[PDB]
């Protein structure tokens, strides 16, 4: 068994110093997708250690090693919503911790919940979205469609199922009150990853940003955790152009595969999921303008040190404008043939 030897080494070899992963591992310029997948569970432990969660919460090391491997194992391999996505989202949470002084805004247990939620937030994703669950009358829709956020409820339920697996409950020494709090936070934070939920609370986020963050305001904590989660989830867009071009490839491969399935079901896919209609530069510009940029502008409004993130996302949006002309075929194709007509 592969997990078992992986577990044995994770537990008995000791936790690698976070600096040994990469020289700018803690920088907003680092691209966590550069880390070999085989190295990621140890990197999770290193980040947990560096944020002092292992010692502060007296987390059992065998239990933690098992949990981390179980969470990794709990992801399938669609083009985008896979473990490397969850790992990179988790890494960005770590970056927020290291760069933005979250301890001035949030409780320790909230920051811990955010990170664990990042690890778990897309568990068992099947490469299709909430709309598809309903349209395809999936088991997940049968369970959760009446509440909405079908996939996100599933990701949360999967997280709980991992904790309820013998040897994997990293929280089971917590007080009943603290345990209840952690699982409630995980619920809220994972459900916040539904972009429909983000769009619903957007005005509230703006309102919070304009009056000013009040650390004594419980609703402000809740709003901030949502914004931070969303910021982690979309953080691929805060990297260099090469990263975001690759992530566009992954997203649309996943989306177009769904679209093909919808067509086969006799359903007309959304344009962004229809490989015959989707014009990727215009779609990406739309995503950046209408969704990503305002999120990181809000983050900047709240945390001035986050300015560079917004600036990157803005820069990436302008890059799509710049390359768009390359999507139109001028001259002949390289084979000199018009066969594709
Ligand atoms: C890091 C990142 C993550 C994502 C998606 C992840 C899954 C959910 N997403 C959507 O439902 C969604 C919503 C609105 C959209 C509008 C225009 C184009 C695409 C859209 C996609 C976002 N995209 N999509 C494009 N670039 C991304 N970059
Ligand atoms: Mg998700
Ligand atoms: Zn995600």
What is the Å distance from ligand 3's center to 87 Cα?
A: 10
The pair of three-digit structure tokens given for residue 182, joined into one six-digit string: 């952690």
Q: For residue 149, give the nearest of 127, 131, 123, 125 by alpha carbon.
A: 131
Burial 170-182 (b: 16+ CB within 10 A, else e): bbeebeeeeeebb
* Contact between residue 84 and residue 43 where contact means Cβ atoms under 8 Å apart: no
* Contact between residue 104 and residue 96 where contact means Cβ atoms under 8 Å apart: no
Q: For residue 310, give the nearest of 299, 323, 326 by alpha carbon.
A: 299
**Among protein residues, the one whose CA lies closest to atom 13 of ligand 1:** 287
- Residues flagged as binding site for Zn(2+): 85, 121-122, 233
DSSP string, 126-184: -S--HHHHHHTT-HHHHHHTTTS-HHHHHHHHHHHHHHTSTT--TTTTS-HHHHHHHHH
Residue 287 near ligand 1, beta carbon < 6 Å = yes
**3-state secondary structure (DSSP) of residue 338:** coil
What resolution in angstroms does the PDB record give? 1.7
What value does the CA radius of gyration of the chain take, rounded to a whole number of Å? 21
The pair of three-digit structure tokens given for residue 249, joined into one six-digit string: 């490839």
What is the Å distance from ligand 1's center to 255 Cα?
A: 9
- Number of the ligand 1 atom closest to the C-alpha atom of 244: 28
**Among protein residues, the one whose CA lies closest to atom 17 of ligand 1:** 287
* Contact between residue 258 and residue 267 where contact means Cβ atoms under 8 Å apart: no
Q: For residue 320, give the nearest of 293, 281, 287 by alpha carbon.
A: 281
Q: In Å, how far from its chain's centre is CA 101? A: 20
Exposed (0-12), middle (13-18) or buried (19+): which is 97, by Cβ within 10 Å? Answer: buried
Residue 194 near ligand 1, beta carbon < 6 Å = no
For the chain, list the domains and their CATH numbers. Answer: 1-341 (1.10.1300.10)
- Residues 316, 174: Cα–Cα separation, whole Å: 43
Q: For residue 294, give the nearest of 241, 244, 231 by alpha carbon.
A: 231
What is the Å distance from ligand 1's center to 133 Cα?
A: 17
Burial 43-66 (b: 16+ CB within 10 A, else e): bbbbbbbbbebbeebebbeebbbb
CA distances from 93 to 111, 166, 245 (A): 9, 27, 22
Catalytic residue set: 81
* Contact between residue 20 and residue 78 where contact means Cβ atoms under 8 Å apart: no
- Residues 178, 174: Cα–Cα separation, whole Å: 6
The pair of three-digit structure tokens given for residue 165, joined into one six-digit string: 């697996």
**3-state secondary structure (DSSP) of residue 219:** helix
- Residues 281, 324: Cα–Cα separation, whole Å: 6
276 DSSP assignment: T
The 3-class secondary structure across 21-60, one letter per residue, is CCCCCCCCCCCHHHCCHHHHHHHHHHHHHHCCHHHHCCCC
Instruction: List, as ranges, residues with CB under 5 A of the ion ligand 2.
Output: 122, 193
Residue 188 near ligand 1, beta carbon < 6 Å = no
Helix, strand, coil percentages in the chain from 3-state DSSP, rounded to 5: 70, 0, 30
């Amino acid at each position: 068994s592969a997990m078992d030897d992986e577990y044995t080494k994770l537990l008995h070899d000791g936790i690698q110093p976070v600096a040994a992963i990469d020289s700018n591992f803690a920088s907003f310029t680092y691209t966590p997708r550069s880390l070999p997948e085989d190295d990621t569970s140890m990197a999770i432990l290193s980040m947990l250690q560096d944020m002092n969660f292992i010692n502060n919460y007296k987390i059992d090391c065998p239990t933690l090693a098992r949990f981390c491997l179980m969470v990794k194992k709990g992801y399938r391999d669609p083009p985008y919503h896979n473990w490397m996505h969850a790992f990179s989202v988790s890494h960005f949470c770590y970056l927020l911790y290291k760069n933005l002084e979250l301890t001035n805004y949030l409780e320790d247990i909230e920051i811990f919940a955010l990170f664990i939620s990042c690890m778990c937030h897309d568990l068992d994703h099947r490469g299709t979205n909430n709309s598809f669950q309903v349209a395809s009358k999936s088991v997940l829709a049968a369970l959760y469609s009446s509440e909405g956020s079908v996939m996100e409820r599933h990701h949360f339920a999967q997280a709980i199922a991992i904790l309820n697996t013998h040897g994997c409950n990293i929280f089971d020494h917590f007080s009943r009150k603290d345990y209840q709090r952690m699982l409630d936070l995980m619920r809220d934070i994972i459900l916040a990853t539904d972009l429909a939920h983000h769009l619903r609370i957007f005005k509230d986020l703006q309102k919070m940003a304009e009056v000013g963050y009040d650390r004594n305001n419980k609703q402000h904590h809740r709003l901030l955790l949502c914004l931070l989660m969303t910021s982690c989830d979309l953080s691929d867009q805060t990297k260099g152009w090469k990263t975001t071009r690759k992530i566009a490839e992954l997203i649309y491969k996943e989306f177009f595969s769904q679209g093909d399935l919808e067509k086969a079901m006799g359903n007309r896919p959304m344009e962004m999921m229809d490989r015959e209609k989707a014009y990727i530069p215009e779609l990406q510009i739309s995503f950046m303008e209408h969704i990503a940029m305002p999120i990181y502008k809000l983050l900047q409004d709240l945390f001035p040190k986050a300015a560079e993130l917004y600036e990157r996302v803005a820069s990436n949006r302008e890059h799509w404008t710049k390359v768009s002309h390359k999507f139109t075929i001028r001259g002949l194709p390289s084979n000199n043939s018009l066969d594709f007509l």
